[PDB]
PDB file of C-alpha atoms in Angstrom:
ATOM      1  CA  UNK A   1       0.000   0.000   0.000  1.00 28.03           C
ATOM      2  CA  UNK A   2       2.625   2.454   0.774  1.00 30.03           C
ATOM      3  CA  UNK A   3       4.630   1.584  -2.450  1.00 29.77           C
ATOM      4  CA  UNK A   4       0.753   1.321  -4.222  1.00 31.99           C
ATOM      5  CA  UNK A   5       0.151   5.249  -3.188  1.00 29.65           C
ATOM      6  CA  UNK A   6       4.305   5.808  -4.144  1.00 27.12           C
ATOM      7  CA  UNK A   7       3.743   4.661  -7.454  1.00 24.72           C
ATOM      8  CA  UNK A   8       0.312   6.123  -8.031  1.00 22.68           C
ATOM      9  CA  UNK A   9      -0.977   3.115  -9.190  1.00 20.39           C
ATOM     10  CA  UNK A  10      -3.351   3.276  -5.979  1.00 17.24           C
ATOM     11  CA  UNK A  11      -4.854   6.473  -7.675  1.00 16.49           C
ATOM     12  CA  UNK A  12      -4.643   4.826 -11.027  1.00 16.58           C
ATOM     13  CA  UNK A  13      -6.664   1.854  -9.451  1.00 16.54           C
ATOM     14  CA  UNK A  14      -9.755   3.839  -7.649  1.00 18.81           C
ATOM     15  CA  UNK A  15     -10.085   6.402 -10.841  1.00 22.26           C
ATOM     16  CA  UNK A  16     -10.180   3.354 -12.866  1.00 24.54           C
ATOM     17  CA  UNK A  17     -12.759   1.284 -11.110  1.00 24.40           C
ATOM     18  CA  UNK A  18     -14.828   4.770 -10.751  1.00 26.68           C
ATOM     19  CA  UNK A  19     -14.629   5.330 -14.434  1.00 26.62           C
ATOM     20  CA  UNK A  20     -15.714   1.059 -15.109  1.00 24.91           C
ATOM     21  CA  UNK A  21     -18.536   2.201 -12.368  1.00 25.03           C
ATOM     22  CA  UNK A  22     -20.122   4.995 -14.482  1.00 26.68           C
ATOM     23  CA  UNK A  23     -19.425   3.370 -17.628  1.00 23.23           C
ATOM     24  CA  UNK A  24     -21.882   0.192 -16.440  1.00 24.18           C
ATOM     25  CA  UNK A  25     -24.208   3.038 -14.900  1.00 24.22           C
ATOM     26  CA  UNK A  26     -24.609   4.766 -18.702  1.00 25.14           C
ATOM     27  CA  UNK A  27     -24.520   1.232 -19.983  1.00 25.55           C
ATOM     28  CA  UNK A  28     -27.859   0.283 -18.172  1.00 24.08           C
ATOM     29  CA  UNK A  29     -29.094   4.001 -18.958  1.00 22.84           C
ATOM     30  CA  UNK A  30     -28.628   2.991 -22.896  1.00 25.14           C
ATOM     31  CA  UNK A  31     -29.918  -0.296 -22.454  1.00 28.75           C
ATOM     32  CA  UNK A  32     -33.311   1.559 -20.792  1.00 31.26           C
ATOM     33  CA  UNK A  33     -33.394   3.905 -23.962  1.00 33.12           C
ATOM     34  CA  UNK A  34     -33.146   1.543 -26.525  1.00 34.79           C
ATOM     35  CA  UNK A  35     -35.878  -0.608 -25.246  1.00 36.08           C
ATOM     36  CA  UNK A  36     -38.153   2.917 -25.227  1.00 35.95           C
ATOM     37  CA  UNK A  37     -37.069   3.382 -28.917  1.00 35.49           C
ATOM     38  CA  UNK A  38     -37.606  -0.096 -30.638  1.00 34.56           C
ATOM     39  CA  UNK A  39     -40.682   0.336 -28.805  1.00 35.11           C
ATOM     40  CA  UNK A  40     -41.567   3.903 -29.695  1.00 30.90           C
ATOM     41  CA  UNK A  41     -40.929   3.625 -33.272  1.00 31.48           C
ATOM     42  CA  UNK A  42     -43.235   0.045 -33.307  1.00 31.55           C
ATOM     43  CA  UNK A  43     -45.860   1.775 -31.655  1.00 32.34           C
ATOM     44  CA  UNK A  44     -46.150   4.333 -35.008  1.00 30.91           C
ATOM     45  CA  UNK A  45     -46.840   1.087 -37.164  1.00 29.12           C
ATOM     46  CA  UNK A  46     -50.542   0.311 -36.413  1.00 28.44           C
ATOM     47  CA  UNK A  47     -48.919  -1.221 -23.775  1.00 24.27           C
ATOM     48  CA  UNK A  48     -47.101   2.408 -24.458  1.00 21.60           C
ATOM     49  CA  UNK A  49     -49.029   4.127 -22.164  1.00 22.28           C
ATOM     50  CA  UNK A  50     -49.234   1.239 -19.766  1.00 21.17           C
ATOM     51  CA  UNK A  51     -45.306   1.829 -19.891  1.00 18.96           C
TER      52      UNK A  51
ATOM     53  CA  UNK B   1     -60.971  20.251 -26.934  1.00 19.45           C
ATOM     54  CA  UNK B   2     -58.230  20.370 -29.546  1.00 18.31           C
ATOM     55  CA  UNK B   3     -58.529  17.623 -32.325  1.00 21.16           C
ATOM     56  CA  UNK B   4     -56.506  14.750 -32.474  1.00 23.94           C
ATOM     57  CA  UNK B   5     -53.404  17.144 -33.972  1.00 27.12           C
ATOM     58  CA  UNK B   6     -53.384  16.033 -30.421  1.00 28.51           C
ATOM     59  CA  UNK B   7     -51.618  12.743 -31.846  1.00 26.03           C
ATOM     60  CA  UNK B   8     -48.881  14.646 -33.984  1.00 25.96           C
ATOM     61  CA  UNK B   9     -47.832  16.690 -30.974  1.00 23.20           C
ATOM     62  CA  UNK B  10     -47.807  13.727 -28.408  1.00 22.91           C
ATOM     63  CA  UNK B  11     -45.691  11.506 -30.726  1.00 24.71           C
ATOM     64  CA  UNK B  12     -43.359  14.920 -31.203  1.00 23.51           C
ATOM     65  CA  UNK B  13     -42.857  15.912 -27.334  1.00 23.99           C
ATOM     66  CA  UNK B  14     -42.189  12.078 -26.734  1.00 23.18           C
ATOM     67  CA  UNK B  15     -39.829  11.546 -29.364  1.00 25.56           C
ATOM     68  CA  UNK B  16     -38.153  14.837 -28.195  1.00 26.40           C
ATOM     69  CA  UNK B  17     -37.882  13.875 -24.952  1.00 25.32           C
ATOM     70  CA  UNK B  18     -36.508  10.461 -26.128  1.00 25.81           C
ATOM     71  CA  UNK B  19     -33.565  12.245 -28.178  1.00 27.05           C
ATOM     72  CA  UNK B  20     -32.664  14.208 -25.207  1.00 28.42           C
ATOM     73  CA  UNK B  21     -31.778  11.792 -23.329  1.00 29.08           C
ATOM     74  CA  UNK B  22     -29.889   9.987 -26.175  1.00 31.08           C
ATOM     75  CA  UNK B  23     -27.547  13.383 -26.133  1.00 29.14           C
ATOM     76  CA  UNK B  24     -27.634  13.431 -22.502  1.00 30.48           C
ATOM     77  CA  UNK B  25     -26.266  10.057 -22.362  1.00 28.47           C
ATOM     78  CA  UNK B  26     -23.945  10.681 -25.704  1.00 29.44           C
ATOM     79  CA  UNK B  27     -22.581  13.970 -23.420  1.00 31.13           C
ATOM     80  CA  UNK B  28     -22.043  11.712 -20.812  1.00 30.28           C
ATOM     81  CA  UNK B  29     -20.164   9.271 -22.564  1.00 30.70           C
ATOM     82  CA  UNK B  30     -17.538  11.786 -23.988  1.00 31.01           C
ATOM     83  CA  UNK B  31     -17.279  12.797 -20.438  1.00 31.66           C
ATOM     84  CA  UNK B  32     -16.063   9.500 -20.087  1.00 31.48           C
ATOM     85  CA  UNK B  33     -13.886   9.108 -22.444  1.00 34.92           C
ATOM     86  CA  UNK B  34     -11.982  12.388 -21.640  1.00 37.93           C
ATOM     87  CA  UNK B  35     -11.544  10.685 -18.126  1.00 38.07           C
ATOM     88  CA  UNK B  36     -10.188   7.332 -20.150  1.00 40.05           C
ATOM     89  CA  UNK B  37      -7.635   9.547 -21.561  1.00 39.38           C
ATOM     90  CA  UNK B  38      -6.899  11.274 -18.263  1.00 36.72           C
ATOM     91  CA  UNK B  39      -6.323   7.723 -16.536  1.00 35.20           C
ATOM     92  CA  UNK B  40      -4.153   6.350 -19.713  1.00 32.76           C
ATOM     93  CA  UNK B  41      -1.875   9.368 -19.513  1.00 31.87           C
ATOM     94  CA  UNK B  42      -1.536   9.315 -15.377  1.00 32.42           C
ATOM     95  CA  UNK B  43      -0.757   5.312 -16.459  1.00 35.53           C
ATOM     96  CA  UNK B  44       1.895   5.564 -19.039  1.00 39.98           C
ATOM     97  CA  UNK B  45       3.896   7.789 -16.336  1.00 36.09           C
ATOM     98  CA  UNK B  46       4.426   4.773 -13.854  1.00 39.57           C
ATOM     99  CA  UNK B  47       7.948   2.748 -14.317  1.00 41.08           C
TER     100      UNK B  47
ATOM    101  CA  UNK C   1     -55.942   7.631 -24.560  1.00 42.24           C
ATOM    102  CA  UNK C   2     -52.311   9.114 -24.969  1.00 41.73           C
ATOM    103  CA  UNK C   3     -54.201  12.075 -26.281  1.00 39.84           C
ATOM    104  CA  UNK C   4     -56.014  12.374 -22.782  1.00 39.59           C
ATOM    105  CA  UNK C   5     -52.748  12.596 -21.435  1.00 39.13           C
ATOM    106  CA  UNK C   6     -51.623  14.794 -23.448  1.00 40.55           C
ATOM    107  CA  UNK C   7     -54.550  17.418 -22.988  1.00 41.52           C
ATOM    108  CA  UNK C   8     -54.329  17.060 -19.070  1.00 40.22           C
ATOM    109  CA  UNK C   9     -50.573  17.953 -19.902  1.00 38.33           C
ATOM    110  CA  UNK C  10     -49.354  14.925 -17.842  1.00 36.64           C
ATOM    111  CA  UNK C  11     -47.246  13.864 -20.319  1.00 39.54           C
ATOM    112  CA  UNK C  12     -44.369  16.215 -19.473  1.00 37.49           C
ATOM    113  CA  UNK C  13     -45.172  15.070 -15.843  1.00 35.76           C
ATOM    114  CA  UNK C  14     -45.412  11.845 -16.163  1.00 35.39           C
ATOM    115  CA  UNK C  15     -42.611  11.566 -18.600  1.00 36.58           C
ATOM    116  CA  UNK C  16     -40.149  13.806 -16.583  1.00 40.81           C
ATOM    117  CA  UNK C  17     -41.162  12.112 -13.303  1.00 40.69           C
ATOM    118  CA  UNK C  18     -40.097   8.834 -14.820  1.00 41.90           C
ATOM    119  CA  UNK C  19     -36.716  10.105 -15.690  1.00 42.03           C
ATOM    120  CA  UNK C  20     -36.532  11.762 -11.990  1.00 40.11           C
ATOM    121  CA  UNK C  21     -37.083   8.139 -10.312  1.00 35.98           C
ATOM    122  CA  UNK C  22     -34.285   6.166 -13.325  1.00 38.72           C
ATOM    123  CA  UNK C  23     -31.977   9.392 -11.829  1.00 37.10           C
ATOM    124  CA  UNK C  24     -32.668   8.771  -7.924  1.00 33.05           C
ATOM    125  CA  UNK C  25     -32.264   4.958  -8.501  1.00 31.05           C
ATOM    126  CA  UNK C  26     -28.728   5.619  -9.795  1.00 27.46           C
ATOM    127  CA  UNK C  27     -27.148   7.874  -7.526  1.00 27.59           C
ATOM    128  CA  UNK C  28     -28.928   5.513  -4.740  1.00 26.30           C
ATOM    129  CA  UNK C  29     -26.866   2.244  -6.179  1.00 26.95           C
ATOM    130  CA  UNK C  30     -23.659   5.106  -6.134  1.00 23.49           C
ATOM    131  CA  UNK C  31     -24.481   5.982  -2.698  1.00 23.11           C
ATOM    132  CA  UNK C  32     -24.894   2.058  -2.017  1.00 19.74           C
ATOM    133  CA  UNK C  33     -21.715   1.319  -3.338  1.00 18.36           C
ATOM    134  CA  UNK C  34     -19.750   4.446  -1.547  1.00 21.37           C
ATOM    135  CA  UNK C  35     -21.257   3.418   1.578  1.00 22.85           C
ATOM    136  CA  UNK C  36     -19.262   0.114   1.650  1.00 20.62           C
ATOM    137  CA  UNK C  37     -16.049   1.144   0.578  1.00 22.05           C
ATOM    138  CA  UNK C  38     -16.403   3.906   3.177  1.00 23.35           C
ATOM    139  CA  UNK C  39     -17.421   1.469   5.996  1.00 25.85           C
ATOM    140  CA  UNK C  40     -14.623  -0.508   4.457  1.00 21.09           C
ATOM    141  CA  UNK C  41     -12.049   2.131   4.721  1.00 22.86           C
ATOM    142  CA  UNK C  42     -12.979   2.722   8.655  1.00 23.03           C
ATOM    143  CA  UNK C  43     -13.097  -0.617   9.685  1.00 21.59           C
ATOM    144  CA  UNK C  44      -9.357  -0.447   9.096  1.00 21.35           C
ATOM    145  CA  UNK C  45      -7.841   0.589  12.174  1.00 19.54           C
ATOM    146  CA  UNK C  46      -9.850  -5.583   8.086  1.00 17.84           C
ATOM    147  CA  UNK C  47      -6.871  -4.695   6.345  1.00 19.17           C
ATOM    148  CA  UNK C  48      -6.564  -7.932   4.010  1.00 19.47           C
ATOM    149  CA  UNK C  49     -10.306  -7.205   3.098  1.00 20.83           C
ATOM    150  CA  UNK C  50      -9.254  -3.536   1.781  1.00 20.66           C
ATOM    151  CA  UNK C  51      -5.965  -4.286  -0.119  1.00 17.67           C
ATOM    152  CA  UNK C  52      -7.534  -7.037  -1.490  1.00 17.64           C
ATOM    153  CA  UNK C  53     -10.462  -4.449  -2.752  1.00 17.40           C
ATOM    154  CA  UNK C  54      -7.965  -2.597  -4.654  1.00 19.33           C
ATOM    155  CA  UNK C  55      -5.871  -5.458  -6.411  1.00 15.88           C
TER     156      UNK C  55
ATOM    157  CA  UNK D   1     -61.074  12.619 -17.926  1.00 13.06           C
ATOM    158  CA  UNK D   2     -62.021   9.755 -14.668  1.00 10.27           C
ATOM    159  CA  UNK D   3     -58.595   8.558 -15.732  1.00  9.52           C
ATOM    160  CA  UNK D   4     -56.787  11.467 -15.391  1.00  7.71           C
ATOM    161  CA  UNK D   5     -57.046  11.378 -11.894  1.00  8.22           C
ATOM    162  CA  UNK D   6     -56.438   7.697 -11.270  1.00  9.37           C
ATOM    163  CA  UNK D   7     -52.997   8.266 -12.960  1.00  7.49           C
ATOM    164  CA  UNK D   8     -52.697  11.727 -11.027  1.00  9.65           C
ATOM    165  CA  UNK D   9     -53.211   9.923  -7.405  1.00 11.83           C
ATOM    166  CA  UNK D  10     -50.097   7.475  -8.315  1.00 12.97           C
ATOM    167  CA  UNK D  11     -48.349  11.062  -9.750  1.00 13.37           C
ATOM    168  CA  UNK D  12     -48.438  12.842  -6.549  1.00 11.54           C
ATOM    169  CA  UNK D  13     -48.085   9.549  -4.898  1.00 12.62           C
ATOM    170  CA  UNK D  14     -45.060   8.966  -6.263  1.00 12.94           C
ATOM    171  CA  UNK D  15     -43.290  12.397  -6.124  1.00 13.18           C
ATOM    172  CA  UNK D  16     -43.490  12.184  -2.460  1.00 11.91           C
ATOM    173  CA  UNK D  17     -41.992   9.391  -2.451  1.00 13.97           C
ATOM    174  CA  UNK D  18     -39.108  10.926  -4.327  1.00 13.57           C
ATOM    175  CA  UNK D  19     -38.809  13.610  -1.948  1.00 11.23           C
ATOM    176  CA  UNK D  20     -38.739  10.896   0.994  1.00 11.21           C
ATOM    177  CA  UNK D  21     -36.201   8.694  -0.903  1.00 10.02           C
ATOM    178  CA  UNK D  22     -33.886  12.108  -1.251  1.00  9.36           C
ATOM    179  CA  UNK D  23     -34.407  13.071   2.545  1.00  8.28           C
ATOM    180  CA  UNK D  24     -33.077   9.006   2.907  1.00  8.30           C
ATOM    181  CA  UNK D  25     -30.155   9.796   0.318  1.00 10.86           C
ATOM    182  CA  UNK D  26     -29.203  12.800   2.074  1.00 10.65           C
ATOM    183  CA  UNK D  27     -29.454  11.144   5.442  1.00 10.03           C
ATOM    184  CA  UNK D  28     -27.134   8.157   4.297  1.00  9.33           C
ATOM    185  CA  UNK D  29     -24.658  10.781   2.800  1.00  7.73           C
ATOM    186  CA  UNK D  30     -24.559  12.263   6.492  1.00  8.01           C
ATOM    187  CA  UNK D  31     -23.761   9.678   7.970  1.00  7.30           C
ATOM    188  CA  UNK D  32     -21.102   8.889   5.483  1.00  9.66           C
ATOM    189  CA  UNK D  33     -19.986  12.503   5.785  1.00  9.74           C
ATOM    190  CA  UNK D  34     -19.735  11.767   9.724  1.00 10.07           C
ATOM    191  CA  UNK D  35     -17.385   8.908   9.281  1.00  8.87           C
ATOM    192  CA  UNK D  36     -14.417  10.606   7.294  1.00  6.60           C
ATOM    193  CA  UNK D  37     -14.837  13.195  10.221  1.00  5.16           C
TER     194      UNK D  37
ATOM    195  CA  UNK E   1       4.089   7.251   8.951  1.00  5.23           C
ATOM    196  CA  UNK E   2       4.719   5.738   5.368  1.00  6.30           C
ATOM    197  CA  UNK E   3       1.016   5.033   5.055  1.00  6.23           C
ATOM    198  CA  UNK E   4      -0.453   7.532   7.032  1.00  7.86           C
ATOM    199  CA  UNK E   5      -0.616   9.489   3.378  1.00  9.45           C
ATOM    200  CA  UNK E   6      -1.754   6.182   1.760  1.00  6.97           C
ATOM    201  CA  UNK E   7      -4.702   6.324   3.818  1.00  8.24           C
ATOM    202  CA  UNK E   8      -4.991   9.656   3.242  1.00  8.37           C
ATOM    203  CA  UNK E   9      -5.045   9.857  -0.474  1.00 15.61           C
ATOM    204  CA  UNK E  10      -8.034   7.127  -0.095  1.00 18.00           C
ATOM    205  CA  UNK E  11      -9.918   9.248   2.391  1.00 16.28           C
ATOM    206  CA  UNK E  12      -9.405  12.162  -0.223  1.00 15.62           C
ATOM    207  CA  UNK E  13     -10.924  10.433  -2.920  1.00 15.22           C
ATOM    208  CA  UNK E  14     -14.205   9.281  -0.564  1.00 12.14           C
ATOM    209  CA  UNK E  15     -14.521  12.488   0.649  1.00 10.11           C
ATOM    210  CA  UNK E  16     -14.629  13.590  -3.046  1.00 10.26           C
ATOM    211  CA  UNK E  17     -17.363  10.976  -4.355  1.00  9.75           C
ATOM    212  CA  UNK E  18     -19.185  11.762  -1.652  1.00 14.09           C
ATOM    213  CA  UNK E  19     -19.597  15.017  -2.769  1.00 12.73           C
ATOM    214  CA  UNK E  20     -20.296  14.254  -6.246  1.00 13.52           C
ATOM    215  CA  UNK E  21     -23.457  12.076  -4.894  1.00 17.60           C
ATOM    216  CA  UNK E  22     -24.459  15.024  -3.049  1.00 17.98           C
ATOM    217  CA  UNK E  23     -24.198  17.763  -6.058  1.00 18.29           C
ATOM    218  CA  UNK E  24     -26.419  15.695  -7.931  1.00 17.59           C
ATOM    219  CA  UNK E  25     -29.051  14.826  -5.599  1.00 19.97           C
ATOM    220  CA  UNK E  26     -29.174  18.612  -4.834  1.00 14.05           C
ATOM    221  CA  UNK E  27     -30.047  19.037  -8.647  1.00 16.60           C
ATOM    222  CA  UNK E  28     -32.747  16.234  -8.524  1.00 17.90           C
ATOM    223  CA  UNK E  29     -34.082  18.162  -5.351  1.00 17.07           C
ATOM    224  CA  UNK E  30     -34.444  21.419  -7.289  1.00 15.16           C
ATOM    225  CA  UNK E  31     -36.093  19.408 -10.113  1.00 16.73           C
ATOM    226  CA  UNK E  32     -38.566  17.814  -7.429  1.00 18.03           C
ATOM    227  CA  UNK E  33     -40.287  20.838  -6.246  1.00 17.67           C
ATOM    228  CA  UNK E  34     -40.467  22.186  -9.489  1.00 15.02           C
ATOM    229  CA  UNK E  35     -42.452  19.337 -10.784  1.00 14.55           C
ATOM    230  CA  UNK E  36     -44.643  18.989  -7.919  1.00 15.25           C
ATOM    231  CA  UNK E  37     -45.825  22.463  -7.819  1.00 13.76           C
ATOM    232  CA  UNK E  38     -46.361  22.395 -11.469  1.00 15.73           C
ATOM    233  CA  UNK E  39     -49.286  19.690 -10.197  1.00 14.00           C
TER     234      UNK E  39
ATOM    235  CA  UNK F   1       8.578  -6.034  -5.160  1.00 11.39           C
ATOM    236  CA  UNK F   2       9.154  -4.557  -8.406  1.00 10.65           C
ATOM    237  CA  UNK F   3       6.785  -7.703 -10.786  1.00  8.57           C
ATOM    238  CA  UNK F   4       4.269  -7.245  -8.353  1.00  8.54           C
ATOM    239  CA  UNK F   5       3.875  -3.942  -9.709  1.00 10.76           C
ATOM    240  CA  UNK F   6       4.264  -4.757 -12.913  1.00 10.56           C
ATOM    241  CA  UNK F   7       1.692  -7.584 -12.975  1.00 12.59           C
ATOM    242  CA  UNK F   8      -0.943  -4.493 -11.298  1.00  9.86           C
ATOM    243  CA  UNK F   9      -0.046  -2.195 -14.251  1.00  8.01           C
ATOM    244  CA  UNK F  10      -1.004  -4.857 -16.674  1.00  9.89           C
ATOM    245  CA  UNK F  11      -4.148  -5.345 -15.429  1.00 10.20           C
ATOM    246  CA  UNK F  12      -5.143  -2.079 -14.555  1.00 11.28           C
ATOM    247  CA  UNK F  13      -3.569  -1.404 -18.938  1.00 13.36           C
ATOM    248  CA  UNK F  14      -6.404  -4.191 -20.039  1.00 17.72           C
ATOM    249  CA  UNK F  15      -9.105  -2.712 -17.701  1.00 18.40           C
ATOM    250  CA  UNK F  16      -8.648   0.870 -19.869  1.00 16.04           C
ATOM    251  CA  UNK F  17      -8.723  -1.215 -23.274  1.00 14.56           C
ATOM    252  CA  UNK F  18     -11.891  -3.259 -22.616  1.00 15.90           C
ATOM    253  CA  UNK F  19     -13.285   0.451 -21.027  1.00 16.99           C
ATOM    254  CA  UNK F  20     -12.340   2.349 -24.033  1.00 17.94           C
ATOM    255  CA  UNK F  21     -14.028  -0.279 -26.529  1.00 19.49           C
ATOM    256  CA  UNK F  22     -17.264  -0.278 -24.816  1.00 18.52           C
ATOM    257  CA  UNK F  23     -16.725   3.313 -25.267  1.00 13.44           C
ATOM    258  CA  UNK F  24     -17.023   2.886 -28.623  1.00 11.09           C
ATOM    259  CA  UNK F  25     -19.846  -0.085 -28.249  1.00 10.44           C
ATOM    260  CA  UNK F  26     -21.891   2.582 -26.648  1.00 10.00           C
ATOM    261  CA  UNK F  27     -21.412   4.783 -28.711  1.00 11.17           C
ATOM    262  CA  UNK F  28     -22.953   2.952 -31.835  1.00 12.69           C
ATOM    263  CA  UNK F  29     -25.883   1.913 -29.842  1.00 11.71           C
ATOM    264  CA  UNK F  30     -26.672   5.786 -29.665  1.00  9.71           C
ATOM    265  CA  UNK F  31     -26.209   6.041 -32.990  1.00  8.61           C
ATOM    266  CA  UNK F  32     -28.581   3.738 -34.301  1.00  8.73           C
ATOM    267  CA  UNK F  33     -30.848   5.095 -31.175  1.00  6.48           C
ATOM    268  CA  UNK F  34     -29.509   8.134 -32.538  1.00  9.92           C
ATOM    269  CA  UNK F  35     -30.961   7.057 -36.095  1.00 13.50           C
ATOM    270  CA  UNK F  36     -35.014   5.506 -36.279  1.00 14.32           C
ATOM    271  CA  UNK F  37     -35.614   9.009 -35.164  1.00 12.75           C
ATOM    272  CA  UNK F  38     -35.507  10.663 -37.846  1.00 16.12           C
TER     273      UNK F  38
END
């Protein structure tokens, strides 16, 4: 630990499992929106509102 | 009371609000990638 | 029936209240997952548990 | 127009319990706050 | 006294998170009250 | 403990490439989000 924060791979560590945090957060955001699209543009073809 | 240009106008405001959030995700994303570059740079400077 | 909606303007309510609860669910898994690492952190004073967080 | 409302109850229904899940977020934070003294 | 600045650096970075989480449920407050008046 | 290191590096190297390509996975997804509308 004390040659971890020396080295600043401890800093290098904690940004990088931050940045692999939000990446899985806006990876469930774009998985939300693309089930609203695929959905909106199907419902302009002919449960929506039930959504 | 209005007619169903009711329709047209609902299907706009959603679809609007739907494409914000695809450039509020697409901002976020870059953010992210700035930080990638940040992280890659602080990386290549350790022996 | 959207168009009901619509002319109540609940839409934008409805709509925007959606995206307000997908936003407070997020930060609340963040504020999940800083919680532990926190407690984590303090606890140390264990240690094993940490380092072993970080490799 | 008798569904308006039906959807408005679960509205206002559910916007206080946003403001009570904040309150809980910010209460959590606190605490969190507390600990790194 | 080696790691006391270890420790430090990872307290740094907590106390920063945490108020990250706060700045944005702050902003989701503001937006909160403005959609419930609007009601 | 100078490999020690070294082994930490490499992971921490593979964590950024597999990040910065689902940057770019993401980033198509929006697009063809991005696309259907128009």
């Amino acid at each position: 630990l004390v040659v971890l924060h020396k080295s600043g791979l401890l800093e290098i560590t904690l940004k990088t499992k931050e940045l692999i945090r939000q990446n899985q957060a806006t990876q469930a955001e774009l998985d939300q929106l693309k089930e609203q699209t695929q959905m909106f543009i199907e419902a302009t073809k002919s449960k929506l509102q039930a959504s | 009371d209005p007619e169903f240009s009711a329709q047209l106008g609902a299907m706009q405001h959603l679809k609007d609000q739907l494409e914000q959030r695809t450039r509020m995700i697409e901002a976020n994303i870059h953010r992210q990638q700035e930080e990638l570059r940040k992280i890659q740079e602080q990386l290549q400077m350790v022996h």
